[PDB]
Amino acid sequence: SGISLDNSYKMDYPEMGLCIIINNKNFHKSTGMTSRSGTDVDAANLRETFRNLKYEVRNKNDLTREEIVELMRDVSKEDHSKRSSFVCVLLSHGEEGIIFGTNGPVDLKKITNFFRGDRCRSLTGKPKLFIIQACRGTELDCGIET
Amino acid sequence: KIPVDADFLYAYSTAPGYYSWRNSKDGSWFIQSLCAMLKQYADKLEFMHILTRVNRKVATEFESFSFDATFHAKKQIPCIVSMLTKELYFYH
Numbered sequence: 001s002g003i004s005l006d007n008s009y010k011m012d013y014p015e016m017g018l019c020i021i022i023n024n025k026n027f028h029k030s031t032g033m034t035s036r037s038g039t040d041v042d043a044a045n046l047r048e049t050f051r052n053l054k055y056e057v058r059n060k061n062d063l064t065r066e067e068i069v070e071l072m073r074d075v076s077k078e079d080h081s082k083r084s085s086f087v088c089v090l091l092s093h094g095e096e097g098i099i100f101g102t103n104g105p106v107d108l109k110k111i112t113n114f115f116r117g118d119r120c121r122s123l124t125g126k127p128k129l130f131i132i133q134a135c136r137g138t139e140l141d142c143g144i145e146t
Numbered sequence: 147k148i149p150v151d152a153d154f155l156y157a158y159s160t161a162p163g164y165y166s167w168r169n170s171k172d173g174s175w176f177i178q179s180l181c182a183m184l185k186q187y188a189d190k191l192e193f194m195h196i197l198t199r200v201n202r203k204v205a206t207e208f209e210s211f212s213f214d215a216t217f218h219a220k221k222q223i224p225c226i227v228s229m230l231t232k233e234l235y236f237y238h
């Protein structure tokens with residue numbers, strides 16, 4: 001072969017990979033969390049956008065903290081050998097390091113740990129993308145006029 | 147060996163510590179901008195460069211309007227966190 005550089009990820013596997021979209025709109029009462037009006041617009045936009053990039057999109061609506069952890073655990077246990085990459089989109093309330101299930105918080109580290117290079121071997125060396133629409137705290141940016 | 151944390155990318159809607167804006171009818175500033183930039187550039191640009199365009203779009207085109215002075219006239223910058231080890235193109 002000619003000179004081979006390895007500067008870009010191999011993205012010509014038979015499949016681009018999964019795009020898991022967790023769309024949390026409606027929350028349990030004792031959490032005191034408001035309904036996230038507009039999130040379905042985001043969810044539809046993402047499904048279409050990633051469909052056109054040839055990702056296998058899976059939408060999940062209004063998951064509890066337990067269901068989020070179970071979903072991610074199960075997804076990380078699939079054989080991704082024939083897949084180029086993995087995408088997970090999280091749409092919910094949040095705080096720094098935390099995403100909300102409908103019934104309480106999940107540490108983001110708990111979700112992403114399932115996909116560590118030592119824990120999801122069929123994704124080792126492949127890009128794992130986590131796209132997060134949630135607050136990371138309460139600070140407001142006042143901006144500056146240019 | 148590679149690090150177990152290698153090859154992750156987090157595309158956060160907002161800076162660490164910060165609020166993230168969402169509109170009832172358009173969706174979130176970040177997701178609307180992300181989808182627009184992917185639509186326009188995924189067959190053209192490397193992923194970090196797409197995400198940089200998303201940063202600019204959110205930073206420049208959106209500002210909050212609120213009857214509550216506390217939440218009025220606010221801005222947002224998304225935050226790309228890359229532990230990737232290679233360039234990523236959605237096309238080949």
Ligand SMILES: O=C(O)c1cc(S(=O)(=O)NCCS)ccc1O
Pocket residue numbers: 167168169170209210211212
């Ligand atoms: O620009 C917006 O998206 C915006 C959205 C709202 S909102 O009431 O639809 N959401 C804020 C609390 S979830 C209020 C003020 C705003 O400028």
Ligand SMILES: *CC(=O)[C@H](CC(=O)O)NC(=O)CS
Pocket residue numbers: 036091092093094095133134135136165166167168169174
């Ligand atoms: C503070 C939050 O976690 C949410 C994130 C979201 O997309 O709903 N932000 C708001 O409630 C402000 S619109």
